[PDB]
Amino acid sequence: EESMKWKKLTNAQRSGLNQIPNRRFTLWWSPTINRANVYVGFQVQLDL
RNA sequence: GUGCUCGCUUCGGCAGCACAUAUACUAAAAUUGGAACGAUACAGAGAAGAUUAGCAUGGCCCCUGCGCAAGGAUGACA
């Protein structure tokens, strides 16, 4: 992600690269955000 | 069918008369065909650059060598 910070990327490529911090934050707090206490509703299993 | 004709005619009947005027995708049944993104089976990183190593070229500035052209200043008695 650091090496790609300056490599002449298109706007759509950079927009899809400023999401890694959000993905890492969501994964760090995943045992709390994905809880079924928060987000009441049906649960879905990843098929692997 | 109902009721009526001063009709034939008998109450057993007959001839005529008024009203009735055109429903239905019509259908109960006939058959043989073509068929999932529903399951199981497979795969499943389901969103990234699709790369980095040398050398040479190209630009600028010196230094050295060779060539071409045009030149400058200087040196040498018997």
SS (H, E, C) A1-45: CCHHHHCCCCHHHHHCCCCHHHHHHHHHCHHHHCCCCCCCCCCCC
Q: What is the resolution of this structure in A?
A: 3.1
Q: Which nucleotide is nearest to A9 if distance is taken from CA to C1'?
A: B49
**Residue A44 has which token pair?**
């879905």
Q: Which nucleotides of B are covered by protein (CB under 7 A)?
A: 43-50
Output DSSP code: residue A47.
Answer: -
Structure tokens at A27: 């994964």
